[PDB]
Design an enzyme around this catalytic site. Structure first.
Site, PDB file in Angstrom:
ATOM      1  N   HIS A   4      -0.807   4.376  16.463  1.00 27.72           N
ATOM      2  CA  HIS A   4       0.203   3.668  16.026  1.00 27.72           C
ATOM      3  C   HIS A   4       1.482   3.881  16.693  1.00 27.72           C
ATOM      4  CE1 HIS A   4      -2.404   2.630  12.569  1.00 27.72           C
ATOM      5  NE2 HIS A   4      -2.931   3.670  12.849  1.00 27.72           N
ATOM      6  N   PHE A  53       1.531  10.475   1.628  1.00 27.66           N
ATOM      7  CA  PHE A  53       1.120   9.991   3.264  1.00 27.66           C
ATOM      8  C   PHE A  53       2.352   9.218   3.664  1.00 27.66           C
ATOM      9  CE2 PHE A  53      -2.917  11.609   2.022  1.00 27.66           C
ATOM     10  CZ  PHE A  53      -3.220  12.576   2.741  1.00 27.66           C
ATOM     11  N   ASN A  84      -1.807  -1.476  12.321  1.00 32.79           N
ATOM     12  CA  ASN A  84      -2.752  -2.171  13.078  1.00 32.79           C
ATOM     13  C   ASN A  84      -3.895  -2.407  12.549  1.00 32.79           C
ATOM     14  OD1 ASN A  84      -4.144  -0.327  14.542  1.00 32.79           O
ATOM     15  ND2 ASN A  84      -2.091   0.473  15.485  1.00 32.79           N
ATOM     16  N   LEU A 127      -2.218  10.028  13.539  1.00 35.93           N
ATOM     17  CA  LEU A 127      -1.956   8.680  13.875  1.00 35.93           C
ATOM     18  C   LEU A 127      -1.443   8.710  15.409  1.00 35.93           C
ATOM     19  CD1 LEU A 127      -0.890   7.400  10.425  1.00 35.93           C
ATOM     20  CD2 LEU A 127      -3.248   7.408  11.407  1.00 35.93           C
ATOM     21  N   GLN A 157       3.575   1.454   3.153  1.00 32.97           N
ATOM     22  CA  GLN A 157       3.037   0.422   4.010  1.00 32.97           C
ATOM     23  C   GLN A 157       3.485  -1.211   3.451  1.00 32.97           C
ATOM     24  OE1 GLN A 157      -0.764   0.526   5.560  1.00 32.97           O
ATOM     25  NE2 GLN A 157      -1.016  -1.482   6.231  1.00 32.97           N
ATOM     26  N   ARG A 168       0.968  -1.345   0.072  1.00 38.21           N
ATOM     27  CA  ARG A 168       0.089   0.107  -0.045  1.00 38.21           C
ATOM     28  C   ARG A 168       0.876   1.297   0.054  1.00 38.21           C
ATOM     29  NH1 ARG A 168      -3.703  -0.226   4.694  1.00 38.21           N
ATOM     30  NH2 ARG A 168      -4.980  -1.303   3.232  1.00 38.21           N
ATOM     31  N   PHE A 201       4.665   1.093   8.654  1.00 42.92           N
ATOM     32  CA  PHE A 201       4.646   2.084   7.518  1.00 42.92           C
ATOM     33  C   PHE A 201       5.717   3.166   7.603  1.00 42.92           C
ATOM     34  CE2 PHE A 201       2.374   5.547   9.554  1.00 42.92           C
ATOM     35  CZ  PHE A 201       1.763   4.731  11.045  1.00 42.92           C
TER      36      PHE A 201
HETATM   37  C1  LIG Z   1     -10.837   8.530   4.241  1.00 43.93           C
HETATM   38  C2  LIG Z   1      -9.909   7.833   3.091  1.00 43.93           C
HETATM   39  N1  LIG Z   1      -8.599   7.474   3.993  1.00 43.93           N
HETATM   40  C3  LIG Z   1      -7.607   8.199   4.148  1.00 43.93           C
HETATM   41  C4  LIG Z   1      -7.352   9.498   3.650  1.00 43.93           C
HETATM   42  C5  LIG Z   1      -7.176  10.580   4.571  1.00 43.93           C
HETATM   43  C6  LIG Z   1      -6.783  11.954   4.096  1.00 43.93           C
HETATM   44  N2  LIG Z   1      -6.950  12.877   5.152  1.00 43.93           N
HETATM   45  C7  LIG Z   1      -6.449  12.569   6.363  1.00 43.93           C
HETATM   46  C8  LIG Z   1      -6.010  13.601   7.149  1.00 43.93           C
HETATM   47  N3  LIG Z   1      -6.145  15.095   6.751  1.00 43.93           N
HETATM   48  C9  LIG Z   1      -5.458  15.967   7.345  1.00 43.93           C
HETATM   49  C10 LIG Z   1      -5.613  16.414   8.743  1.00 43.93           C
HETATM   50  C11 LIG Z   1      -5.854  17.411   7.904  1.00 43.93           C
HETATM   51  C12 LIG Z   1      -5.976  15.187   5.129  1.00 43.93           C
HETATM   52  C13 LIG Z   1      -7.056  14.075   4.438  1.00 43.93           C
HETATM   53  C14 LIG Z   1      -6.801  12.065   2.824  1.00 43.93           C
HETATM   54  N4  LIG Z   1      -7.013  11.239   1.679  1.00 43.93           N
HETATM   55  C15 LIG Z   1      -7.112   9.977   2.426  1.00 43.93           C
HETATM   56  C16 LIG Z   1      -7.079   8.649   1.153  1.00 43.93           C
HETATM   57  C17 LIG Z   1      -6.041   9.036   0.133  1.00 43.93           C
HETATM   58  O1  LIG Z   1      -8.337   9.161   0.519  1.00 43.93           O
HETATM   59  C18 LIG Z   1      -8.577   7.999  -0.526  1.00 43.93           C
HETATM   60  C19 LIG Z   1      -6.634   7.343   4.840  1.00 43.93           C
HETATM   61  C20 LIG Z   1      -7.354   6.138   5.330  1.00 43.93           C
HETATM   62  C21 LIG Z   1      -7.225   4.924   6.056  1.00 43.93           C
HETATM   63  C22 LIG Z   1      -7.876   4.003   6.091  1.00 43.93           C
HETATM   64  C23 LIG Z   1      -9.216   4.242   5.502  1.00 43.93           C
HETATM   65  C24 LIG Z   1      -9.406   5.186   4.620  1.00 43.93           C
HETATM   66  C25 LIG Z   1      -8.555   6.328   4.543  1.00 43.93           C
HETATM   67  C26 LIG Z   1      -7.568   2.943   6.955  1.00 43.93           C
HETATM   68  C27 LIG Z   1      -8.114   1.768   6.716  1.00 43.93           C
HETATM   69  S1  LIG Z   1      -7.417   0.700   7.728  1.00 43.93           S
HETATM   70  C28 LIG Z   1      -6.420   1.735   8.164  1.00 43.93           C
HETATM   71  N5  LIG Z   1      -6.687   3.078   7.708  1.00 43.93           N
HETATM   72  C29 LIG Z   1      -5.225   1.544   9.254  1.00 43.93           C
HETATM   73  C30 LIG Z   1      -4.024   0.675   8.722  1.00 43.93           C
HETATM   74  N6  LIG Z   1      -4.387  -1.006   9.116  1.00 43.93           N
HETATM   75  C31 LIG Z   1      -4.125  -1.847   8.175  1.00 43.93           C
HETATM   76  O2  LIG Z   1      -3.490  -1.686   7.172  1.00 43.93           O
HETATM   77  C32 LIG Z   1      -4.327  -3.329   9.100  1.00 43.93           C
HETATM   78  C33 LIG Z   1      -4.699  -4.382   8.038  1.00 43.93           C
HETATM   79  C34 LIG Z   1      -5.255  -5.785   8.499  1.00 43.93           C
HETATM   80  O3  LIG Z   1      -4.392  -5.738   9.835  1.00 43.93           O
HETATM   81  C35 LIG Z   1      -3.067  -5.548   9.546  1.00 43.93           C
HETATM   82  C36 LIG Z   1      -3.324  -4.416   8.318  1.00 43.93           C
HETATM   83  C37 LIG Z   1      -2.740   0.854   9.182  1.00 43.93           C
HETATM   84  O4  LIG Z   1      -2.311   0.452   9.915  1.00 43.93           O
HETATM   85  N7  LIG Z   1      -2.190   1.622   8.198  1.00 43.93           N
HETATM   86  C38 LIG Z   1      -0.866   2.533   8.666  1.00 43.93           C
HETATM   87  C39 LIG Z   1      -1.244   3.968   8.756  1.00 43.93           C
HETATM   88  C40 LIG Z   1      -1.859   4.474   7.587  1.00 43.93           C
HETATM   89  C41 LIG Z   1      -2.838   3.596   7.247  1.00 43.93           C
HETATM   90  N8  LIG Z   1      -2.803   2.453   7.342  1.00 43.93           N
HETATM   91  C42 LIG Z   1      -3.462   4.342   5.748  1.00 43.93           C
HETATM   92  O5  LIG Z   1      -3.388   3.423   4.867  1.00 43.93           O
HETATM   93  O6  LIG Z   1      -3.903   5.477   5.671  1.00 43.93           O
HETATM   94  C43 LIG Z   1      -4.036   6.042   4.671  1.00 43.93           C
HETATM   95  C44 LIG Z   1      -4.147   7.521   4.642  1.00 43.93           C
HETATM   96  C45 LIG Z   1      -4.160   8.196   3.343  1.00 43.93           C
HETATM   97  C46 LIG Z   1      -2.943   8.200   5.575  1.00 43.93           C
HETATM   98  C47 LIG Z   1      -5.590   8.068   5.480  1.00 43.93           C
END
Ligand SMILES: CCn1c(-c2cc(N3CCN(C4CC4)CC3)cnc2[C@H](C)OC)c2c3cc(ccc31)-c1csc(n1)C[C@H](NC(=O)[C@H]1[C@@H]3COC[C@@H]31)C(=O)N1CCC[C@H](N1)C(=O)OCC(C)(C)C2
Ligand SMILES: Nc1nc2c(ncn2[C@@H]2O[C@H](COP(=O)(O)OP(=O)(O)NP(=O)(O)O)[C@@H](O)[C@H]2O)c(=O)[nH]1
Ligand SMILES: [Mg+2]
Lengths: 170, 163
Positions: free
Chosen positions: B124, B58, B100, B120, B61, B53, B111
């Site tokens: 995390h 951002f 997580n 976060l 991962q 991912r 990540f």
């Molecule tokens: C709403 C859309 N959207 C966004 C997001 C948000 C924003 N913002 C937020 C913040 N604003 C600022 C304050 C002003 C700006 C706009 C912009 N655009 C987006 C995206 C690009 O729009 C498509 C996110 C995001 C994250 C999740 C779901 C939807 C999300 C999500 C689902 S699951 C998880 N998060 C935690 C995940 N868990 C697992 O993978 C478990 C799997 C099973 O067991 C082990 C393994 C985990 O640990 N990480 C490790 C940590 C980063 C994290 N993944 C991740 O991918 O974050 C993606 C992202 C882009 C950082 C956040």
């Protein structure tokens, strides 16, 4: 050509939005938990003797990003509002999802179907009548589904298409 | 604090080495898990696994070496272990932190931030940072997308601990 219907699947994390969608599109059941960021799918189907194209947006249940749901609620034509029958909190979350859609759409009249998923599981904490009563009070359909057994999967998505068609042609 | 490296490849072609300082001073149990997974000394670990991912703006991962689909991974203490502490914050690009599925579910997925991700904090466990090769992590973003699916296979072709 064929009509496209923009469907959006919403609900609390873990209720089975993606398992339902993947059952519909790919005919298999995801046993593993792959929490969604955002996914989009296409499938053509025959509903009431006519072929149509479903465009399905599978959304994240993550509560931390509740304020970023507005953009997809603006473009979606109909909403599958999913809870899990063994998770009372996810049922309580339904009210809040529906109210957000109404607010973003600025409408009390938005095509929606209430879906009670995980009906294969014995741990039931939300009763059918309680969900039926709620859907009736909303004026929308209610369907119990299992993404694991496929019970009700096609019916929930096709019923939502019928709700959108009625709304477009009104 | 120990240092580990990943040699990254893109569709099997070398891209370069990233090294990381692991904050054993502040999060010893979490740092030791990532160290041992990087050397492979328990009989499993990150070598050959992919960054599943990548979301430009951002983070990158990876770490699912059991299922290779974003759902797996395991720690050296069992499939999951507890959140050790949240002392350290997601302060900027280069932070190395555990992925997580909710509280106390750390495994092997991790990540690397390419921006500050303050929301976060407290959710995390931050346990290291990039030392050398941040530009390799930046270069990995060329292969990401809005929902994180990658356009080439980004792998940890080799990894281990630096003396
Ligand atoms: C709403 C859309 N959207 C966004 C997001 C948000 C924003 N913002 C937020 C913040 N604003 C600022 C304050 C002003 C700006 C706009 C912009 N655009 C987006 C995206 C690009 O729009 C498509 C996110 C995001 C994250 C999740 C779901 C939807 C999300 C999500 C689902 S699951 C998880 N998060 C935690 C995940 N868990 C697992 O993978 C478990 C799997 C099973 O067991 C082990 C393994 C985990 O640990 N990480 C490790 C940590 C980063 C994290 N993944 C991740 O991918 O974050 C993606 C992202 C882009 C950082 C956040
Ligand atoms: N028994 C049973 N398990 C189900 C059912 N639907 C989903 N699950 C399981 O419940 C878990 C969560 O399913 P998933 O489809 O990922 O839920 P989601 O609503 O998309 N979660 P998110 O909002 O994080 O993307 C997975 O382990 C999945 O196999 C169902 O009808 N029956
Ligand atoms: Mg999902």
């Amino acid at each position: 050509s064929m009509t496209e219907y923009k469907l959006v699947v919403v609900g609390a994390a873990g209720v089975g939005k993606s398992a339902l969608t993947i059952q519909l599109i790919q005919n298999h059941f995801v046993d593993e938990y792959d929490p969604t960021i955002e996914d989009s799918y296409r499938k053509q189907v025959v509903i009431d003797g006519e072929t149509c194209l479903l465009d399905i947006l599978d959304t994240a249940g993550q509560e931390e990003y509740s304020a970023m749901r507005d953009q997809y609620m603006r473009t979606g034509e109909g909403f599958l509002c999913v809870f899990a029958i063994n998770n009372t909190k996810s049922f309580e979350d339904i009210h809040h999802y529906r109210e957000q859609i109404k607010r973003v759409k600025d409408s009390e009249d938005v095509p929606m179907v209430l879906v009670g998923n995980k009906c294969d599981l014995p741990s039931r904490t939300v009763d059918t009548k309680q969900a039926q009563d709620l859907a009736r009070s909303y004026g929308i359909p209610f369907i119990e589904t299992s993404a694991k057994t496929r019970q009700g999967v096609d019916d929930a998505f096709y019923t939502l298409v019928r709700e959108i068609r009625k709304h477009k042609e009104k | 604090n120990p240092t580990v490296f990943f040699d990254i490849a893109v569709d099997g072609e070398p891209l370069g080495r990233v090294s990381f300082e692991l904050f054993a001073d502040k999060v010893p149990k979490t740092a030791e898990n990532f160290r041992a997974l990087s050397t492979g000394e328990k009989g499993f670990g990150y070598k050959g696994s992919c960054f599943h991912r990548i979301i430009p703006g951002f983070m990158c991962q990876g770490g699912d070496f059991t299922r290779h689909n974003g759902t797996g991974g395991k720690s050296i203490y069992g499939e999951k272990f507890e959140d050790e502490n949240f002392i350290l914050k997601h302060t900027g690009p280069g932070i190395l932190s555990m992925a997580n599925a909710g509280p106390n579910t750390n495994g092997s997925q991790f990540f690397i931030c390419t921006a500050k991700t303050e929301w976060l904090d407290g959710k995390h466990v931050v346990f290291g940072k990039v030392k050398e090769g941040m530009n390799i992590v930046e270069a990995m973003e060329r292969f990401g997308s809005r929902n994180g699916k990658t356009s080439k296979k980004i792998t940890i072709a080799d990894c281990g601990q630096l003396e």
